[PDB]
Amino acid sequence: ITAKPAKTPTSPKEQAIGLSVTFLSFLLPAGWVLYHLDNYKKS
Amino acid sequence: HQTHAYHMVNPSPWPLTGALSALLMTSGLTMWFHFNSMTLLMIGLTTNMLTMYQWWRDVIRESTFQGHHTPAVQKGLRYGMILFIISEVLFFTGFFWAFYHSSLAPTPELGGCWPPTGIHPLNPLEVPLLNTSVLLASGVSITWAHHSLMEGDRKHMLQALFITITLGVYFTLLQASEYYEAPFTISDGVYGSTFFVATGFHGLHVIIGSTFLIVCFFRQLKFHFTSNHHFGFEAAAWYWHFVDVVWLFLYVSIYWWGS
Amino acid sequence: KIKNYQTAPFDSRFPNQNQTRNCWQNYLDFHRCEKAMTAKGGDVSVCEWYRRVYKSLCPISWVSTWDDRRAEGTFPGKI
Amino acid sequence: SVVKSEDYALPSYVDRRDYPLPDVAHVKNLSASQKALKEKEKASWSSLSIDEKVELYRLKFKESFAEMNRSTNEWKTVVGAAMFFIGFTALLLIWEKHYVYGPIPHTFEEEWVAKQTKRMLDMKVAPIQGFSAKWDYDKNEWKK
Amino acid sequence: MAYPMQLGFQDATSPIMEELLHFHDHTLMIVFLISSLVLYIISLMLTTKLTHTSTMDAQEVETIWTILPAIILILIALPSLRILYMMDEINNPSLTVKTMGHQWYWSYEYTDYEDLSFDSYMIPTSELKPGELRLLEVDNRVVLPMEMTIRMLVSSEDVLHSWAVPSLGLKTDAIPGRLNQTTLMSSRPGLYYGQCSEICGSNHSFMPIVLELVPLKYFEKWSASML
Amino acid sequence: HYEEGPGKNIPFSVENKWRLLAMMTLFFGSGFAAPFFIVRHQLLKK
Amino acid sequence: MFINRWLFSTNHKDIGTLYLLFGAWAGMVGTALSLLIRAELGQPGTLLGDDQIYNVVVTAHAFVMIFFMVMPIMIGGFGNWLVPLMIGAPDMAFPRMNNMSFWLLPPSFLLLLASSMVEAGAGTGWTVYPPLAGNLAHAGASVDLTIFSLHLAGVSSILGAINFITTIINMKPPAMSQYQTPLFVWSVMITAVLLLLSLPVLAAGITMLLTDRNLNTTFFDPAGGGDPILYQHLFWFFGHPEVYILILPGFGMISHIVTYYSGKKEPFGYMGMVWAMMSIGFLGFIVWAHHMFTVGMDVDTRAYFTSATMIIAIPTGVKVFSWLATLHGGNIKWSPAMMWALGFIFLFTVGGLTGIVLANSSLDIVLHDTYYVVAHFHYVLSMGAVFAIMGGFVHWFPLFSGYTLNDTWAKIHFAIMFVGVNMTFFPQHFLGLSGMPRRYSDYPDAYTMWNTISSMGSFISLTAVMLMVFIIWEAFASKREVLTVDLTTTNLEWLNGCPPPYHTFEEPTYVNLK
Amino acid sequence: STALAKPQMRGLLARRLRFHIVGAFMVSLGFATFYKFAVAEKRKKAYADFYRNYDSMKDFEEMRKAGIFQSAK
Amino acid sequence: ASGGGVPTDEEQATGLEREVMLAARKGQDPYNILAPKATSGTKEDPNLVPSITNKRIVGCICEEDNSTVIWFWLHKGEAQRCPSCGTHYKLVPHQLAH
Amino acid sequence: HETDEEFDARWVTYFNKPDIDAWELRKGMNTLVGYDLVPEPKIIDAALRACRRLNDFASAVRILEVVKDKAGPHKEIYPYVIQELRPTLNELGISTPEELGLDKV
Amino acid sequence: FENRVAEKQKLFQEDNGLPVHLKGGATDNILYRVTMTLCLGGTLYSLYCLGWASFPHK
């Protein structure tokens, strides 16, 4: 396939931000639940 | 401007109101079964009837009034109706499987016999036989209705279609009376389970088919059908014959062989 | 005593994995025989083989339930 | 030169080793000099200079076969990055072990395992090949 | 029982389980070969710059790769079905034992002669005696005479369970209202372990099976003592 | 009629990549978090 | 305008887009449930301390991945986008009924989530066997909510099947016969026939379970003369066709991806591929009781189900060898979609072969209800259906969106996923051979090592899932618009541009009969 | 400057295919032979060697003396 | 026995259904219900492809019973050739209906 | 099911058609490289002369490149084919890709 | 009865840009709003019922 160059280029810095935000959106809420599992058990 | 013959449908809210009505009916049944309340269920049944009404109303608008049903579109609806009927056949096939599984291998709890100890089946030569002649006759009279319509005869189409509906209604009344008089119930083990769930779903399909025929009756009164274009009538006739054939299998299997 | 009973022998009427009917048949047979022998005065000892087989095969809880229902008048098999 | 989206339904240029002669020339519009080069091309090619032959080729085609088939270093990036993210995954597992998992059951303590191992040997667990088979009951040791 | 880092089946305790080990060896060889051949052919198709993109005729080669797999299936099915029928063949048991599944424990009934029955529960982890196996030991083992053909009858008094002992090749579902038969013959004394094998609710993981296989005269005295 | 073309045939806006990052984060993150919070809910009941 | 377009749609592309978004969201739910599974098992002992909740998580994981992830993406998503384009049709036959098939799924999913939130959830297994699923061992609303969830998803797919069959039979160019349609179109039609015939039988069986739970029927209750084993026959009479439903559109996409990146104008042996899918579809209705080899079945029945099941390897092998033959001689493009497809061919073959092991009812006695089954079907599902989905998503993303992905990031994603799924599931064969049951929250100590490795592998696949979200974001963030696509002469769906206009084929294609 | 000989120019792909399929077959038979040695027959011989002089009463008495049984002390 | 009162299509068909019906009676196919029959497809006798615009997609089944169809845009202007079999097609734009 | 010599001769005849047009030149070359062979020098000769009748120097060079490509790892084929074509290359003034620097990455 | 189909054809073919489900006139809009109000309101109510049923009640 061929394509135009990016209309709104995403620099390495911007990719690191998008990748970081993405991973955190998965890891933090589940990490919060799992870390407090002991507090849920025993209720 | 298109230069194929197929129908691009206007954006419609009825898919969404039908989907929501399904949520409200299933939610509603849950609420009825477990939380002593019929409120959700009544709303879902209401939105379901409203959805069906406006959706099929719009199909009538699109075809009779706007002319979108070219031969290609009509051919597609024929396939769609045939496929739908096939899926309904397989649905009944699951209940016939349940019936034969239980009755061909009656467990000790039943007395090791079919009909179970303590079950007294209806006489298949009384009301069940009458029911059979009623649906068989309605299959004759709806074929008369179809030929009258194709031959351009409005009055005899209406007479034959009215006879067909009347017989459908007679069957439903006879079946409701048989249900009330039956000395066994749905809670009478697997005999009552298979009897009432299989004939009960069949009864629901008789009601649906009679409703469909009644829709065709009023479309005919309003001159919607031409002598060559009347797919709603054909579909209701195919569905009606399906309901007839399922009855014949129920009659032979559950009422006669299973008695 | 045409026995020396170890356990219930293979029964060609019930050769497959589901043995429910073997248990049920020998239970029915024992109680049918005991009813006929108890009527005409005879000795239930002629019923012994059916008794041994169904006791070997049948779950305790089934026998117990079937015994209760026969006493209650609700046993659905024919004896 | 410049390919446009609204040209999608037209024949297009591509460099593919298995479609050597694409549907259009790489360069459609010709300058004054390029026009005269194409006129020169109608005479004997022996009178074209090397530079003129290369200019002709580059009007017709974008990349040569050697250019279009060149290998790249991309595998280093792919393999190295995948290892980085697999490495990151072990960080998550260290976190899970430290903050989520409690102690495992007391049956994994060394003395428990030694006693359970003897009992398995005493009951001859898997004595044909799997386990006790590997113990020497005469020398009272694992078979060497 | 299984041992740490085990790769294959538990060592066979019954001759039928031995048959299954050899049949699995046969079948696994075929599995390895076919999967290896596919992986290899993939790598072969992908490692040349030579090309051939015109239309290829298929009829010749589709014979090969219909008939060869059909032959291979038959070479699997024949030993498979032999084992299946051999398992089914008439045995003449010396003893019948019933087991009833419950939530969550097994009961056992030995009623050929006396009315012997008892419940068999997992030993909780905190009560294991030193060297006993977490989640596998029970309080009351299924003592059985070794080197003898036993009929096991399996049912349930509540939901489905399934009565399994891998090293004897046994797994028979436990269905209320139904009495499923299987036969058991241990070549060896010892303790043989299995675990409930149909999800039966929250303690499915924790209703194990332990058979204790001993000489007949030991079994007789044990039986007498359990009345 | 309706807008056509890249970025226009979708029910979400891609006009700003950071607002899009937020939306995608809420969207995929809500699906991924839900089972953890359902388990939490069931543990807290008893 | 927004509501008209996206809630009231009658357009096959926009509806396909809705299905892809829904399935992508479902994928997150199903993945998180799978991670909870593997966290419970990642070390000996208990993590949740509540095995009813463990059972609920296992059950939901399966329903989510099957009904809300795979079927909507493959059939609703790729089928709606691609089938009308591939036959030059202007939309589906029933474009408004099509929209109701979509909008029944959010309510279906809501009902499933409701079941897990009320009472103690439905901790039944995705088979929902009675009596465990009955009103004594699972009293209260959870199982009934699960049944109703299945009813709605069932209606959705039955109406979708009618739509696809009608479209594919009735809306081709008048010169195109069925033997001139692309293999993906054939794969959708066959899947739709299987859906049409099997889902009504499931519906019948789960309705009987509903009436046993709520109307005092006793179809499955011995006390009334019923039989739990009857439920199993009805369930698996659907459930085996269901696994062929989950893979057949996958086979269709694989055939297009392998043909395309081999630089071929056509798959090897086209009529053989059609024959193979039809044969698979047909045999897929007469093998269901290999799910019941331990229930106490007569020996001749076992011998028949063993033999009929094995015969499916023959048409399946014709497809595998035909894909290899499509690669043969190709100008191989090593795109990320091609990598997904090559991994598909190998890992699906591994999983299909352990299926043939299980078909032998004598061995299945010892393998049934063990992790050997789990290993088997995650090779055909998590490395078969999922790899076909990723391949098709990478390949056709520029068509659907107008934008390209970063190929390097997409290759990295494939690499991580390939390591993760194999580390997760390959050791489960050992656990199964050595006797570990499935549906367990904890295991005897000997099984610790393989369970530990398997749970670590599931975190690697999580990292790949997270990266996939970033990759999609980066594509939409950067906006590289497509210019040229190769091989459009044999890939009609690309020929209206990227993305195609809302209405395509308003003027139909011209095809001569000659 | 001698001329170059004419090489094979036709069917090069098909020739590579044939050569390596044949090679694959030969490796397959080599593996099947090795596996029958190292796995299948090895197992048959272990089971046969084990049971040839196996004394089940002596095995039992050892287990009984190790204290493993509930029913036998 | 006998009587009337049922409308005919000639009386009551409307919209697109009526257009197709009336065109078929004239032997015309403006909504592409029929498959066109091929010419010899030479440069001198090209297949004639009607269109309501300046380009139309052609599918070419190069030989009888090929399963592979060859697809391309046919543009207003000089005849184009199928890239697989070379047979010729020429666009004939027209009118307002088809 | 025709002989090698019959195949080659069909292709020679194809490219030798005096009024062969540009479309036919491309169609021929693009079809020919789909087969499992490197085309005989006599075929390339006819295609190169067709390039000459079509005043297309660049496609003559591209044809030499695809000959080299179709040989894959068989490094002896291309030097033989160029050898056999030397009189035609000289006659028509066709420079090889190597002489033009077009073999450099 | 008399055949009034031609009148309905004229009404539903009038070039007023309305979708078919509203093209009958103001009664369509009313019935539409009734349907969608019951659906959305019933759906919110079902969410409330989920909320209630999600917790134990003694």
Place this chain on the structure above:
Amino acid sequence: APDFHDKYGNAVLASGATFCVAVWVYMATQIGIEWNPSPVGRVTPKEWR
């Protein structure tokens, strides 16, 4: 003109591999994971009764 891979490829491979190996070795050996390997050749059996 060198692309991303020409300029950074070598470093991405080397540092990625180094990081991957080090962190998995650490996770595997240093944080108390019980792998429960075979006792064969490793455990001295001890009296239990």
Place this chain on the structure above:
Amino acid sequence: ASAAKGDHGGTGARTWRFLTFGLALPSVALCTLNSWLHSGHRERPAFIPYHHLRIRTKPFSWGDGNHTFFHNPRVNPLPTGYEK
């Protein structure tokens, strides 16, 4: 089979009306006669509290929870026997 009559030279409305009034409805009228003849209530049998009948695993969602949907006091006993 060919039934026992005869026509196909013309299929049509007249023939199917002929079948409707000459065969189908007379059949219904006969079966109506036969049924509304063997009607009249039969004896209800002695009540026996069989455990495979009058199943109650969950109360019905209507009434007092113990009556089936089309409960007929005359012929449908409750788990405890006929009503008064």
